[PDB]
Amino acid sequence: MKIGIGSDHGGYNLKREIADFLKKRGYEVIDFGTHGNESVDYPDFGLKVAEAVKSGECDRGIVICGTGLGISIAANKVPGIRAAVCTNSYMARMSREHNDANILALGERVVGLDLALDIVDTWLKAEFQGGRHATRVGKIGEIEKKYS
Amino acid sequence: MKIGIGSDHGGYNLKREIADFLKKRGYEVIDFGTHGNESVDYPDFGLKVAEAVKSGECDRGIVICGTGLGISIAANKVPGIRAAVCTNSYMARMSREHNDANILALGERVVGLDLALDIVDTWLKAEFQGGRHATRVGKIGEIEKKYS
Ligand SMILES: O=C[C@H](O)[C@H](O)[C@H](O)[C@H](O)CO
Ligand SMILES: O=C[C@H](O)[C@H](O)[C@H](O)[C@H](O)CO
């Protein structure tokens, strides 16, 4: 399974830690940058990860900024993307079980490293439950079709 | 200002509490439902609040479900909406200061009542900081325009 990862300078150090964690577990990782601490704009990297997920070049993505908010809002602008900002494993599990999220968003200034690794572990392992959740995901798709 | 609020059955009881909190503080509140514990679909209510914010009929909105994730992802599919799922006051403040969020998303199964009122209080008071944050918000607008 291939994981795209991306961040602004606010999520860069946590991104390096997560890239390292994911490889150790045998995931293939595509790092879309950013590639240092220089100030950059979270929507550009949100977009790269979200577009790699939409095109099937990654199966899912993880996006990181100070809070997770900006980069996840930007990712969710892409039709077919469901980016979930999670600050605990319960939200991470539900985002997979219920929302079928294909992007996990994290905030490097909000969650400490080991908590964020717990969240990523939970999210990678949880599974979509279909049923009424698929119905609701289709209704998300109807919003996208409306404003397309 | 006027605040739109909406929820599925997962966010209904916390919605009733926040509506009451907001009125006590002299805000005008437009409740978009849901109106009971009957099982309903979070995208429908996310859309109502998001479209009311987009059309200026509300100035800001608050959307609530079990986790906040699904309804905020749905809200974010609307162009001009920036829905922030917050689990603490720090995220709520940053979502205003940096992301100029015009919808707050909460999860009734994740944050307890007093924490959620703290977050709402923080979010309603925080102010957009412009500058490089305005630039980044514009780049979110470029994503919208691309998939429009
Ligand atoms: O949404 C903004 C992100 O959290 C950034 O990581 C943050 O805004 C930082 O202050 C860059 O100026
Ligand atoms: O995903 C949907 C929301 O969190 C709901 O509030 C919840 O999942 C519901 O129990 C499912 O029917």
The CATH number covering residue A5 comes to: 3.40.1400.10
DSSP string of B85-126, one letter each residue: E-SSHHHHHHHHHTT--SEEEEETTTS-HHHHHHHHHHHHH-
Other residues' Cβ atoms within 10 Å of the Cβ of residue B10: 23
Kindly state the helix (H) or strand (E) to which residue A64 belongs, with its residue range. Answer: strand A60-65
Question: Given strand A60-65, what is the order of strands in its sheet?
Answer: A28-31, A2-7, A60-65, A103-107, A83-85
Residue A131: other Cβ atoms inside 10 A: 9
Q: Which residues of A touch chain B, with CB atoms under 8 Å apart?
A: 39, 41-44, 46-47, 66-67, 69-70, 73-74, 76-79, 82-88, 90-91, 94-95, 98-99, 101, 107, 110, 132, 135-136, 139-140, 142-144, 147-148
Query: Into how many domains does chain A fold?
Result: 1
In single-letter form, the type of residue at position B16 comes to: R
Neighbours of A102 (CB within 10 A): 22
Instruction: Give A15-19 contacts, CB < 8 A, sequence gap 24+.
Output: A15/A64, A17/A113, A17/A116, A17/A117, A18/A62, A18/A64, A18/A106, A18/A116, A18/A117, A18/A120
Resolution (A): 2.1
- HSE value, Cβ hemisphere, 13 Å, CA-based, for B66: 16
Q: H or E element: which one contains A4?
A: strand A2-7
- Paired tokens of A25: 């577990």
Q: Which domain holds residue A23?
A: 1-148
Q: Let me know how long chain B is.
A: 148
Q: Label each residue of A71-103 as H, E or C.
A: HHHHHHCCCCCCEEECCCHHHHHHHHHCCCCCE
* Residue tagged 């979930």 (tokens): A84
* Backbone phi and psi for residue A13, each to the nearest 5 degrees, phi listed first: -70, -40
